[PDB]
Design a protein around this ligand. Structure first.
Ligand code: HEM
Ligand code: HEM
Ligand SMILES: Cc1cc(N)nc(CCc2cc(F)cc(CC[C@@H]3C[C@H](F)CN3C)c2)c1
Ligand SMILES: Cc1cc(N)nc(CCc2cc(F)cc(CC[C@@H]3C[C@H](F)CN3C)c2)c1
Ligand SMILES: C[C@H](O)[C@H](O)[C@H]1CNc2nc(N)[nH]c(=O)c2N1
Ligand SMILES: C[C@H](O)[C@H](O)[C@H]1CNc2nc(N)[nH]c(=O)c2N1
Ligand SMILES: [Zn+2]
Lengths: 413, 408
């Protein structure tokens, strides 16, 4: 690879220079002949594989604290090396854990919210042993991050992987999600994205309310044991009823959403260590709710019912009735969250912040990995400043990664 | 190896085998993806490129290995020997031009690819000749509003010193003027080209919708100015089906989108002047050609006349105004019987095209970054469509602006 890569902004003509890509680690999926940039997703590590991965991370940490090559740096290297030799693994210090988690976010090429990356509250849950203890940690996480509507980003980090047979997992994809119920007639009640997980919960003993907005229980696996169900205390689940500043009939749709987006199915890799349970949360960009959660056809799919109440012509697509209704839905979502003093960011503000963040990273870090396909919002893309911004995508470590769904791999006891 | 693409809305999986037939670079590597970067001969190089193209042409007409195929290969071989180049047959020229469109990974309009009218202008020698061919193209493609895809192919590059170039980026564009008080009258994308026309003797009317002259370079000579006869330039006044004040904005656009600055590569030959045209997707006018900050930038006025609260972005006043502008554009073209497609219909057609291509061809190279419309992305079917991007030839390529290379 060449040592400098240039990215241009075609709206502003600003040209930036990336050198950070020289530190990229794993693969993108692309090759010289094919680009897989729109592909969504393109038995543990041995002693020999772990040594270089740990040294690389330790070097990076000590370089970040301006202590590279110091006595403490060399001692930490040797202590890690000894520990890998005699135990086939090692343990991160709390400082390294915190640094690692913040940098996995800083490195998340698909995240538009990264201007916030250094303000992450990291909860160390590596002393957890049981699913009840996981539940306690997750409740405290949710209560802290929710903060009565003044949301704070947070991550809770459960014990790392050992042999792969003792994994901690949150079986939920997000901590807070609504159930979906497949009906005998083919229709779906609630959130259609969640039918499979909902059926699993019912098999594990969940008694479903069978409603439109039923918060799913947590399904929590500790130390490789079978997962266990826990109901989140409903007073910890902050929710926002959706109304519209102009359309009085919009409240009659009976819509609401929860305030806290919290991803719980990803894997945090730090120094070759694998944290298979690391729920993290921030706050919503409006379009995540208003465009996707409500208007995706395979989701709540309310565009038609909003358009009908707006009395648009729905017989020609060229009336753009869908686009009109989509904007009004996203107006209502932002207005409902702001009126209830629950933190939310519109896509204009978020993308402008991300451009400012990206420019600072280029100037201070030598680059900023970004996945344009994900960074550009799902509505009004070209009137946001990221649409015109060329981006380089590459994988830095520490990182968040996808992992298989645990019901596909779990060996039931 | 076979590759799969999933649509996450329908869960349809397609299997791509066609990418195995690509040879040019994408710009990405195993470690860096450049999927959102806009821009990432001799005898000895030519014959393999010619052989490959002849091979795929005689394979496309089910006469691979025929006597006609062998003789064509020998004919081309001898011709590169004695002249350092060769000439395409008419049938080959048409095949290569349709397939360059078919292979254009950034084009959502490719369902039409095999209905392309190909105008052979390889006998052209002067800018007056180019002007004639271009007027005939414009008149044919416009067709009184029933727009027809077309491409006009001028002589191929020879020694790089005698290139044919259309200096305009599009055949029909409005001028942009650097206003002394700071801003820009007309179209701000074309300010530089507008000044080169004035520098070449063009008398600007200095309006908001002044059609630029053609600036045409034949055989490497200095380019020459021509005015497209105005009866050939179909325009649409933009009005709105419900907002009666919208027509008072004074806006109009031309009906014919016609790219004139790209290079057509066929069998190793380079056609540096190959203007091609189709019809508009409405967002091309109404999102980009009006609302880009570096373009006409009329969102504020529309939102103003709509009495929208513009004090904070979270009112989404920009998004509301954007939709109404695009409603008006579609309404206007349709009301004037000028061919236009909305981004919902266009992306539907492209998904159908993709399925067609995977079944008959083994894949379809597609550039998600460019295929997804610049507004309402995820309520179109292409947003949820995984795509593989790879470079097949014949192809359209970018080239440098002539005013950076030409010696006067
Ligand atoms: C603080 C406010 C935040 C905002 C506004 C935000 C915004 C977003 C958005 C809009 C996406 C794309 C969502 C989608 O379409 O699925 C995303 C993805 C992502 N975010 Fe952030 N995020 C925030 C916080 C965080 C935090 C705290 C972390 C981790 C420490 C994080 C890590 C990620 C990752 C890994 C992805 C990729 C998700 C995937 O590939 O499925 N984000 N973010
Ligand atoms: C017939 C109706 C057509 C429609 C609706 C259409 C639509 C589009 C759109 C929306 C783009 C995005 C480009 C941009 O945003 O600037 C595009 C790109 C492109 N189109 Fe099509 N197109 C059509 C016809 C054609 C024809 C006839 C050709 C060639 C024979 C062609 C070749 C291309 C190429 C090469 C690009 C890539 C341009 C670039 O890389 O800058 N298109 N098309
Ligand atoms: C920490 C964080 C903050 C934030 N703001 N976002 C995320 C992204 C992950 C995510 C979490 C979530 F709780 C809901 C969605 C949106 C729902 C779905 C997911 C699918 F991609 C289509 N919809 C957009 C996406 C993470
Ligand atoms: C043959 C053809 C048909 C069609 N429908 N489209 C194209 C795409 C190229 C293009 C040509 C054109 F004559 C006007 C635009 C307006 C778009 C503008 C250009 C600028 F880069 C920012 N906008 C996106 C774009 C080609
Ligand atoms: C940075 C990015 O590559 C650039 O803005 C691209 C993005 N996608 C696009 N898509 C289309 N259809 N047209 C464009 O001009 C662009 N510009
Ligand atoms: C096929 C395509 O990769 C897929 O629809 C992606 C596109 N971009 C996205 N961008 C975001 N932010 N979130 C998504 O879920 C997706 N989905
Ligand atoms: Zn790529």
């Amino acid at each position: 690879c060449p040592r400098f890569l240039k990215v241009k902004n075609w709206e502003t003509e600003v040209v930036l220079t990336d050198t950070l890509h020289l530190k990229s680690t794993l693969e993108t999926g692309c090759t010289e002949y094919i680009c897989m940039g729109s592909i969504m997703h393109p038995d543990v590590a041995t002693k020999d594989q772990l040594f270089p991965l740990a040294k690389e991370f330790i070097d990076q940490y000590y370089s970040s604290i301006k202590r590279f090559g110091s006595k403490a740096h060399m001692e930490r290297l040797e202590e890690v090396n000894k520990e890998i030799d005699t135990t086939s693994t090692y343990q991160l210090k709390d400082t390294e854990l915190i640094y690692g988690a913040k940098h996995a976010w800083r490195n998340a090429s698909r995240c538009v919210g990264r201007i916030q990356w250094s303000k992450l509250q990291v909860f160390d849950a590596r002393d957890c042993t049981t699913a009840h203890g996981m539940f306690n940690y997750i409740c405290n996480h949710v209560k802290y991050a929710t903060n009565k509507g003044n949301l704070r980003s947070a991550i809770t980090i459960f014990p790392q992987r050992t042999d792969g047979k003792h994994d901690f997992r949150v079986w939920n994809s997000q901590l807070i999600r609504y159930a979906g119920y497949k009906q005998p007639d083919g229709s779906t009640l609630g959130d259609p994205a969640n039918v499979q997980f909902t059926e699993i919960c019912i098999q594990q003993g969940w008694k479903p309310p069978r409603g439109r907005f039923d918060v799913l229980p947590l399904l929590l696996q500790a130390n490789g044991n079978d997962p266990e169900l826990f109901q989140i205390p409903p007073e910890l689940v902050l929710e926002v009823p959706i109304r519209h500043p102009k359309f009085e009939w919009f409240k009659d749709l009976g819509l609401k959403w929860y305030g806290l987006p919290a991803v719980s199915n990803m894997l945090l890799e730090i120094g070759g260590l694998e944290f298979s349970a690391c729920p993290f949360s921030g706050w919503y960009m409006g379009t995540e709710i208003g465009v996707r959660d409500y208007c995706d056809n395979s989701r709540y799919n309310i565009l038609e019912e909003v358009a009908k109440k707006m009395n648009l012509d729905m017989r020609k697509t060229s009336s753009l009735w869908k686009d009109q209704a989509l904007v009004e839905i996203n107006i209502a979502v932002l207005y409902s969250f702001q009126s209830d003093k629950v933190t939310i960011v519109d896509h204009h503000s978020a993308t402008e912040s991300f451009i400012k963040h990206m420019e600072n990273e280029y100037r201070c870090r030598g680059g900023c990995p970004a996945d344009w396909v994900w960074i550009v919002p799902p509505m009004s893309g070209s009137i946001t400043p990221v649409f015109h911004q060329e981006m380089l995508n590459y994988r830095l470590t520490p990182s968040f990664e996808y992992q298989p769904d645990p019901w596909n791999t779990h060996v039931w006891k």
